[PDB]
């Protein structure tokens, strides 16, 4: 059982490296889904205001 529970430990040890890529993925995803679309929506206003 010491060796069996160690399987869970190495899984967590790797899951940490998975979530490290998840942050980076979520960051780029927010640039494409939030930051850039909002910047486009703001330009419409500056044009239709004229």
């Amino acid at each position: 059982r010491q060796e069996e529970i160690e399987i869970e430990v190495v899984q967590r040890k790797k899951q940490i490296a998975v979530e490290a890529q998840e942050i980076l993925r979520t960051d780029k995803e927010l640039i494409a889904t939030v930051r850039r679309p909002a910047e486009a929506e703001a330009h419409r206003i500056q044009q239709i205001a004229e």
């Binding site: 640039i31 494409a32 850039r36 486009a40 419409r44 044009q47």
Partner: protein
């Protein structure tokens, strides 16, 4: 991550064609259509004024 690092360059082009270009086309339409509305109202004003005098 590499796939979404390209999705950025994608939206940056899609939004230019979907969001920016048509809003810019609407601005030009509104401006040259406004000159026509003004032109008609000043000509109509002159007609009503001449008809009164």
């Amino acid at each position: 991550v590499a796939v979404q690092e390209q999705e950025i360059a994608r939206r940056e082009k899609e939004l230019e064609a979907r969001v920016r270009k048509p809003a810019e086309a609407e601005r030009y339409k509104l401006e040259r259509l406004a000159e026509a509305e003004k032109s008609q109202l000043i000509m109509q004003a002159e007609a009503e004024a001449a008809s009164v005098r």
